[PDB]
Structures are given as C-alpha cells and as structure tokens.
C-alpha cells in the first residue's frame, strides 16, 4: 500500500508561509514516513489545490492534513466540498476519483502544538 501525504495550508499571503510549508514537506519526505509528500492550498488561485495534488499523486491511500490552527469553514466546508467529502468536523474516509483519501483533523488542537509553543521558550534542541 503506497501512502501519500498532502499538507493543506491557508494564510498564504504571509511572508515565508509556503517556504515553512515546504520545510515540513522536506523533513517528512526525508524521514521516509510516507511514499510521497505534497503541499497544497485551500481557497482561490494558489496552486496546487488539494484536488490537483491528489490527482498527481501515485498512491493507493492519501492522507490530507489541514495545517490550520482554527477549525473554520476552510476545513469543515471548502476542503471537503473540493474533494466531494462530507462536511463537518472530524476524520473523513472515502475515495477521490477512485483513490482512497482520508481527510484528517486540522493540527490546531494537537498536543504537539501546545508543545511547540512551550519549545519556543524552552528551546530544547
């Protein structure tokens, strides 16, 4: 089973936003954790959109991770709508044009975000 990861962002006009997104893609690609890692973007005219990204991916299952702190309409409506998935909060399983796709929850409430905030002070590393 070839496993893909698409990292989906939005806050995308801010300086160095794509570059930080690409740093995570690079780190995760080098770790071997997934067969393929791509970055994509919600909303209007920033390429690729998550649907293009998934189409281009040569994986049997693709995991879609929203790099959002918030849990608003980009996540509960825009993104699912784009991929033809159910709206609302939470994990969603399904297929996008024949391929298995799982929309994961946004990273916002993850204990790792709490710890990233702590580490900005602690600087253990």
From Swiss-Prot:
EC number: 4.99.1.3
Keywords associated with the record: Cobalamin biosynthesis, Cobalt, Lyase, Metal-binding
Superkingdom classification of source: Archaea
Keyword Metal-binding in annotation: yes
GO biological process per UniProt: anaerobic cobalamin biosynthetic process
Any one GO MF annotation of this record: tetrapyrrole binding
InterPro entries noted in UniProt: CbiX-like, SiroHydchlorin_Cochelatase
Record-listed Co(2+) binding positions: 10, 74
Function as written in the Swiss-Prot or TrEMBL entry: Catalyzes the insertion of Co(2+) into sirohydrochlorin as part of the anaerobic pathway to cobalamin biosynthesis.
Family, as annotated: Belongs to the CbiX family. CbiXS subfamily.
Assembly, per entry: Homotetramer; dimer of dimers.
Protein's name according to its UniProt entry: Sirohydrochlorin cobaltochelatase
Organism: Archaeoglobus fulgidus (strain ATCC 49558 / DSM 4304 / JCM 9628 / NBRC 100126 / VC-16)
Higher taxonomy: Archaea, Methanobacteriati, Methanobacteriota, Archaeoglobi, Archaeoglobales
